[PDB]
Structures are given as structure tokens and as C-alpha cells.
Write a protein that binds this ligand. Structure first.
Ligand SMILES: CSC[C@H]1O[C@@H](n2cnc3c(N)ncnc32)[C@H](O)[C@@H]1O
Ligand SMILES: CSC[C@H]1O[C@@H](n2cnc3c(N)ncnc32)[C@H](O)[C@@H]1O
Ligand SMILES: CSC[C@H]1O[C@@H](n2cnc3c(N)ncnc32)[C@H](O)[C@@H]1O
Ligand SMILES: CSC[C@H]1O[C@@H](n2cnc3c(N)ncnc32)[C@H](O)[C@@H]1O
Lengths: 292, 292, 292, 292
């Protein structure tokens, strides 16, 4: 009971996990990198002292981030990840039998190399001949190449004014950089920060609203992640409709995804996408738009 | 911040709230009592060192516990609360225009008087002329009185083996004590413990399955409670169906409930009662029944 | 075991006391004020989240701050405290039968009023007809009045560049403001911050060295305070010698001080003033002088 | 900072050190073993969840434990350590040019091998040809061998009733086992627990008084150990006097000890052996004697 990892989730609120060990480290100019072996949540990847992915429950975040977008697509073949150095987003994408190519574009080579070696859940993903790793700022990569994609996946940090990832959540990014690189029928999905009853106002509503200014159809959704001590959110965006029944989603999963999902079925997604009264209300009334 | 309340909410997992003050304390034969003034969650009632109700979010637990059961009844008039010394269950029940009598049967008078003295938000509820307070074991109290109720509400602790509340979750209790004290068309609802992706197997699935042995129609549902750092669960049970649309629920809230709910609208209840894949599978495959 | 007061003593080092209650508060523009009722150390006065005085052991700090200076004086009659709003420095001074007048000059009236009411160890001190309370910056008070004193006592915060108390530790303060207000045979004593094996370099050595530039005789000394999690320091300074045997000090205490000291006898002071090898070495080699 | 080692060093009192890592662990029949890499104190050996030796300040404990005893002997040649598996006691003893043989008798081989493997500062000491390691209970080992020593060193745990080390602090042990294994002019020194203003009554005063029943000359002394957040105690005992000046001690260190001590000079020992008022009074009024 003597060693603890502690994080201040919100100020005046601390979440503490008993520690077995501090397994491996790196550090880059971009961020501090650590892998902790924790008692309640297993191995935990921590970046700049912030938990990113815990062994026991990261499947929830990665299944929610990836599967709804691909399943709403009629035939998703090629896909670009903004971020994703941890490798689990890639792992989940690669379970889709329709996928020919996944480009993982992470700014930090140290994250990629670290996780490739030490997040061994992703070992087969990292060695899948369909994966191409690119080391670059994702906005620069997208602007610089002509290739278009069926799905683009944002797996970056929250947009904080003055911060490194903000510019990949702006109206101008989505409109001028992102949409030109989606094929017809293309779907964007991004992680969209906390989506709790109070916490949803921090970035989730703004991301939803910003996407609403650019894409015709925008579907916000959320799920609890125990290790995060909150509900997390994601947003789908597309110029083609995003409206499938629970059973339609299930049929698509059984046909197209190798192995059973552990978190997500069709009903789970329908529930995730039915937000609570107050959260719906904030999203509907939100006027803030991220710009730069 | 200098002052903290710390609770080990699961083995190897600590949840800490910064404190403004420690307001009042009390004690009884059944439990120690404290009211803390916390920074993240306002005033928080703690019983035996376990958080019960926090000012900022107890609305969620109490709206979830109360409103679905009454809204699905054609005309709910009398209601009996097992426990509810804290007073927020009563507060919510008394928001219904159809209600003419609320019996709060809590075993611990010290809890009742403590909250009646110090939980300001329930002052008005405790003084409502429809509210009758009875200090007793709710099982004995139900057996010893022939009166029957349109709704019975379980607001007890989790059924822990050898614990004081266990016996109010057994098949025999439901079948031989509780069911005979429901009027025709009667609805029972109980709090049913943690309903997280892993925590749902502790009691929630067993409470669902136990009620399934006794009532024809049983509807489990859940919602995130920030202050608990988990999803929490409730189960409706009745020998008449419990099936209304979101739109019907919303009309009925407008007709029957004084002022606007803060958490719950019709679609929120639909979402709440659509459990995730793994949770539905546990509930549907469960075989444990609580018996003496 | 649930409520704790925590302080980061040095960074990466936390000292935590179990809390009974948060008894009283104030706040002024100068500082936050709190009285905590702690389990290990009793009642604890905390200013700006920093422990100042704990019930169980503040006698150590106040006996060490006050008694050596007065006892080295042949007949100390009038005495000025820089700071001392907490009242215990005054209490200790007032045990001297030679003392006619104590001036307590604290900048913060809220500290004085708070402690007068709630640090009831000092109740009789605050009501001693010999005490005069002045509310003012001590440097302004000393510069503005002509009255000279037999002993001046610094009971202020550590000198931090840019901070409120720094200017009362400078060479120019001691030389131009302070020494003119000492009578012949006058003794200055000030608290001089941490005096631990590593911590003594922060301010203790600089204070000692600064005093050395102004006063002929300068005697540094230190003692452990359990609640501080360190050795603390004080420095005597005078233009007349400071050299008494342990027995001479004892005889003076029995003659001049009402009641028995609990911490300090003559041998204790001799030991306190014999610093360890490394601390002596830092004090001897120190070249930094506080100036402004 | 995110990772902490926490130890409850007294009831209701927690001392927490930020961690770089958890280096190695081990176990035996007698205790669990861990080596932590801490921010405030460097590498720290922990036995049964209790801090033993920290890299930044263990020099203080080990110089205090060893050097006074040898310096007061005219010519100390052979020495027996009760415990000392950690190796720093040996390290210090081996700094003396007069020493020809050091017996380290520790009951736990796992402690010995753990520290011999992982405590770098003692590598050289463990490989010194004067050092002999014996794995045994030091009481049995002393009884079973007729060899006598110029100095015996107690480096054990505190005598706790019903504990493994209790029997190595009793009058009968000292009188019938230890005293017959001291050569004429022999000196015993033992660690003697906490020696704080309040903590000195736990064992320090009883260890002093017990030794007083058996040896003609007994000298208690103490020093602050930052990592322990307390003053610690040792007691010298001999049938010849233990009385040298600071100047004599310093000359003898120059003559006999390789390189400069970091903590201890002659005046430091004088200060150490001049206890404060309340501590001297406890030691001098004590009547408990440790007996079987
Ligand atoms: C905590 S951020 C999650 C991931 O996004 C990566 N990242 C941050 N900024 C960018 C960017 N501009 N383009 C691509 N990846 C990024 C980080 O290296 C990390 O792996
Ligand atoms: C935290 S338990 C919730 C409430 O249930 C009450 N309680 C516990 N057991 C029973 C019982 N058998 N009957 C009625 N109330 C109970 C407690 O006093 C508390 O206020
Ligand atoms: C923690 S500082 C200790 C005391 O010194 C007081 N103090 C701080 N600055 C000054 C000053 N310049 N003159 C007199 N008292 C002061 C504070 O109000 C507090 O009571
Ligand atoms: C923390 S106890 C200090 C050392 O004493 C050792 N020890 C405990 N009891 C005895 C004993 N009876 N004889 C010798 N060493 C002991 C332990 O293994 C440890 O290394």
C-alpha cells in the first residue's frame, strides 16, 4: 500500500492508483513518456504526467474512437490517423477486413518507438504490412500530400488555446485542410475530450459545434472510461448521412471486423449517441467555434 | 490545496476531494455520520467513511431512482421508501402532483435528524405534510402493516453477505414481503449498486436476476455519477409492463412533475436503459439469485 | 483516517497530518488564515497554507526565539517584536519579571484579532497590561518612533527576494534602522529559517552572514521542531558580548522567568549553539549579504 | 509530481517522498525488501515498508553510530556488528586504519545479498578483506563463539515487545552474553531509537537506563536525520570512561580515519551528547529496565 501514482483530474480532485512499478521511460522534446505498472488498471501509458491508456480499459476508448466511423462507411479502404503513436487506434482499424492501408501520422517518434516496444498489445498491429508510420505534424502531412482517405481519425490531445494540437480542431483546418482529403462518402471522427455532466462544456461542445460549421452531418457520442474517472467523447462528421440502426451496425461488425468487440455493439452505439438532457442542451446552444 | 478527504473507493484506488471544512458529525448504533464541505462537489454526506450524497450531483442519483418508476405508473399516489433518511428521495417524490402520501422508513433516526437539521436542500421536503417519517427496519415495518403502495422505493446500501441490508434484496423478501404490499399495477424500484463496465458484476447483475425470478417485467438502467467515479444502477420491477416512449415520458413529466428535471428527460431514460454490450450479456446470462 | 492536511515542505516531500476539523478561518489582503484541529500536533495555525504554530510543540520555537536573548541581557526592560501577531512570542517575553513593556508590531490586524480570540494559550498574554499592540509594518514603525529598546525580536517570515519581509533582513535595515533603536547593551534576535543539514543554506547562513556585517557579536543556534519536519534556526546579535555558561543561564532563568521552561535550560542552549561540522562550515564561508 | 512513496511514520502522520522509480525488490522469512529511487533522498532501502537508509543522509546515522565508539577506544582492532546487512556500518568501520577485522552478523542473508548487489556506495566495503559476513542471530552467534571484541555495534531494529530484536536489548543479554565478549577496555554502542522531544520516551530512555544497570560509563547522544523526520539516538557503554575533548576527537580522526567525515567533527559529538532539558530529565529519571 506504499507507492501511488496520483493525478489531479480536475483541480481539487485527485485520482490515485497503487503502483507495482515504474516499468520504462523515455522523454522527447514533445513530452515526458512513462509506462507504469498499476494495480487497479494494469500497465498505464502516461504522457506529461497524464494517463493516456490503461491496460484494463483502453479497449473502450479505442473501440469507441474507431468502429463507429468505419462501420457507417460502405467500404472503408484507406485511413489516416492524426496522432496514434500509442498504436491501439491502428490495432483497432486493422481488425477491419475492408482496410488496405492505415497511415499513422504521429509528431513524436519517441512515442512510436516506445509503444512499439513496450505496449505489446499492439505488437501485431505495428508489424501489419498495411500500416505505414509517418513521423510528422499531421496538419503538415495532410496539407503536403494529395492522397484522399475514406476515414480520417483524430487521436490527438484536447484543443487548448496556445497549445500544440489546437490548430487541428479549427474551422479552417476542417474546411480547408481536412475535407479536401476525404473521398466522397468520407467520414471524419475525432476524440473530443471529457463528456461528463459538468465536464462536457470544456471542449466537447465546442468541437461538436465547430464540426457543425463545416460538415453536413455531425454525430456526438460518449462512453465511460473507468481509468479516466469520467465520461469521454468522440464526434463523427461527414457530408453523407450517419444513420444506421443497432442491428445494421451489428451485421456490419460480424461481416467486417475480425474477432468480437468487447465494448461496442450496435445498441451500445445507439445509447452512446443518445446524450443526456443537459449535455444535448449545451451542444445545441453552443456558439463557440474554434478558429485561427 | 491543503485539506483533503480521501476515500479508497476500490482496492488500490483512492479518490480525493479538497475540503473547505468539516461541517458536522454524528453517530448511532448503525453508523458514523459526517457532513463535509468539499470543493469539487459541495456538501457531502458521509456514512461510515463512505460517500453517500454530494450537493453538486446527487440530483442525478435521486432523479434516476424516483422519476422512471412514477412516470410509468398511470396514477401513483402512495409510496414507501426503504431507507431515504438523507431526504433527497423524498424531495424528488414530492415533486409529483399525483402523490398524496410518502412514507420514509429509515432504521437510523440519527441519520434522519442529522439530514433534517443540516441538508438545506431537503428542508422543505422534510416539512411537507404528505411526508411521514417512520424509524424502523423497512422489512419489519412492511410485514407489520397491511397497507399497500403504488410504488415502493429501495434506497438502501448494497446487499453485502452478512450485512444489515442483504435481507432486503432476497427472492423471499421480494416474493413474500414486498410483492404483497404493492397495489395492483404496483411498481418497485431499487438502487442496484455499481454498473460500470467491470463493477456491474458485484451486485447489479444479481439484483436484476433476483427481481426476474419474482416480477414479470424488469427493466435495469444506469447513469454516471461524477462524485462516485462510476456508473450507478437501478432496477424497475412490476407485474405490468414498463414501456413508454421518450415522447410519452416527456409529456408525463410536463403533466405531473413540478418544475424541470435537471438530469432526466425521456431520451435520457431510453439511453439509460440501453446497457452496453458486456453489461447486457452479464445481466442476461446471470444465474445467482439472492436467498437467505 | 479520511481527512488530512498536507503540506509540501520541500518540493517532492509531503508532510501530512490527520485532521479532526477545520476550526476557524479568516483571510486578509496579507494572507489566508486558518486554525486546524490536527491529530498528531493539536491545534495548528496555518498562514497562506503554511503551518506556523502547532499546539504540541510551538513552545520549542517560542522559548528558543525569546529566552536566550533576554537572558544574555543584564536587565531587559523594554522589547519590540517585529511580527508576533500569533501572540506566543509575547507570552514568552511576558514571563520575564524584568519586563515592563512589550510592543507587538504586526502588519496584519486580522492575524492579531484571530489569535487573540482563538489561540487561547495566549489569552493572558494578550490581556497583560504590559503589552502594547501596534498594527503596522515593523520597518515603518521603527523608523517613525524614537524609542529605543533593550531587545528587538524578529518573528517574521523568511526573506524571499521580491517578498513582503525581505527588507527587514537587509544589511541597511540592521545598520540604519535597527541598531539605532537598540540601547547600549541591546540584543537583537531573529528567527532565521530552516537549519537542517541541507536546508541551512537557504536563508540561515545568509542571515547569520548579514548580521555579521553589522553587529560585533553574532551567535547562531538551532533546534528541532517536530511539526516543522526540520531543524529551525535563530540568530542573536549584539555589540556587547554574548557568552554565558549553561549554569549562568540556568541561574538567570530561575531568578527572572516565571514558571519552568519546558524546552530550554542552559545546557540546551549551549548544545543549540554548537552547530554541526557542515553547518558551521557553511556559516563560516558564507559570502552572501542581503541588500536593498 | 505524479509518483509517491508514502509511509505512516507515526499514527496520523504521513511522510511522502516523490519517486523516480522502484529499482529492485526481494523477500525472506524475516522481511520484505525494496529499493526505491526517490527525489528528495536518492536511493532508499525499505524493509517491511519502513524506511531504513536513504542515500542523501545515511552518512549521518552511520558516522554517528560508528565513529564515537572507535575514537574513544585507545586502539580498536576487532569489531562485531549485530545486524548491519545494509553495509554502511561496515563501510564506516573500515574507514579506520586501526581496524583489522569486522564481523557483520546479520540474521537475514537476503538483506545482505540484496544490498551487496544493489547498494553501490557499499560495494567496496563488502569486498574488503577485513570484512567477514556471518549469517546468524547475533545473540546465538555471540554465545556460540568465545572470541572477544574491542567494540561491539548494535545496528538492529528497535526493541518492541514480542519482536525479533527485543532480546538483544535486555539486562540479561548485556550482562551475560555481550559483556563477556568485550575485551578489557571494550566499548559497546547501540542505535537506540527515536530521540525527539516526545519520541525519546518510546525506547531511547529505556535503552539508556538498561545499559546503566550493567556498564559503569554510559553516554547517550543524538542527531537529526532528515529522511526520518526525527532525531535519532545512540548509546555508548563501557567499563572505562568515555571522555575526550572535541580537540582530542578531531586529532584522533585525523590520525585514524581515512578521508574527512562528512557529518561528525569533535564539536558535533559534544553537541550530540548534550541532550535538551526534557530529554535529559527523562533519561535521568527513567526506571524501566528491559528484561525477558
Ligand atoms: C497526448 S497527444 C496524443 C498523441 O498525439 C501526438 N501528437 C501531438 N500533436 C500532434 C500533431 N500535431 N500531429 C500528429 N501527432 C501529434 C502525440 O505525440 C501523442 O502521441
Ligand atoms: C447508506 S444506507 C442508506 C440508508 O438505509 C438505512 N438503512 C439501512 N438498513 C436499513 C433497513 N433494514 N431498513 C431501513 N433503512 C435502513 C440507513 O440508515 C441509511 O440511511
Ligand atoms: C508568516 S509571517 C509571520 C507574521 O509576521 C507578520 N508580518 C509580515 N510582514 C510584516 C511586517 N513587515 N511588519 C510586521 N509584521 C509583519 C504577519 O502578519 C504574520 O503575523
Ligand atoms: C531493520 S533491522 C536491521 C538489521 O537487523 C537484522 N536483524 C534482525 N534481528 C537480528 C538478530 N537477532 N541478529 C542479527 N541481525 C538481526 C535484519 O536482518 C536487518 O538487516
Amino acid at each position: 500500500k506504499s507507492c501511488w501514482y496520483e493525478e489531479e483530474i480536475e483541480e481539487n480532485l485527485r485520482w490515485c492508483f497503487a503502483l507495482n512499478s515504474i516499468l520504462h521511460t523515455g522523454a522527447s522534446q514533445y513530452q515526458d513518456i512513462a509506462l507504469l505498472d498499476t494495480k487497479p488498471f494494469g500497465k498505464a501509458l502516461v504522457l506529461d504526467g497524464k494517463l493516456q491508456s490503461a491496460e484494463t480499459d483502453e479497449f473502450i476508448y479505442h473501440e469507441c474512437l474507431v468502429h463507429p466511423a468505419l462501420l457507417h462507411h460502405p467500404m472503408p479502404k484507406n485511413v489516416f490517423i492524426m496522432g496514434g503513436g500509442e498504436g491501439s487506434t491502428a490495432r483497432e482499424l486493422l481488425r477491419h477486413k475492408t482496410i488496405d492501408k492505415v497511415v499513422m501520422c504521429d509528431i513524436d517518434e519517441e512515442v512510436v518507438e516506445f509503444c512499439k516496444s513496450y505496449l505489446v498489445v499492439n505488437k501485431e498491429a505495428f508489424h501489419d504490412s498495411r500500416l505505414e508510420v509517418v513521423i510528422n505534424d499531421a496538419k503538415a502531412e495532410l496539407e503536403g500530400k494529395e492522397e484522399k482517405y475514406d476515414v480520417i481519425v483524430g487521436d490527438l490531445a484536447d484543443p487548448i488555446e496556445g497549445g500544440p494540437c489546437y490548430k487541428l480542431y479549427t474551422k479552417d483546418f476542417y474546411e480547408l485542410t481536412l475535407k479536401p482529403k476525404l473521398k466522397k462518402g468520407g467520414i471524419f471522427v475525432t476524440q473530443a475530450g471529457p463528456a461528463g455532466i459538468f465536464s462536457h462544456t470544456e471542449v466537447f461542445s465546442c468541437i461538436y459545434n465547430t464540426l457543425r460549421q463545416v460538415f453536413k452531418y455531425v454525430v456526438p457520442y460518449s462512453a465511460h472510461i473507468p481509468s479516466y474517472a469520467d465520461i469521454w467523447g468522440w464526434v463523427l462528421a461527414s457530408d453523407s448521412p450517419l444513420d444506421l440502426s443497432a442491428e445494421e451496425l451489428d451485421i456490419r461488425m460480424r461481416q467486417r471486423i475480425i474477432e468480437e468487440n468487447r465494448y461496442l455493439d450496435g445498441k451500445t452505439f445507439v445509447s452512446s449517441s443518445t446524450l443526456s438532457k443537459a449535455v444535448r442542451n449545451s451542444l445545441n446552444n453552443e456558439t463557440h467555434v474554434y478558429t485561427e
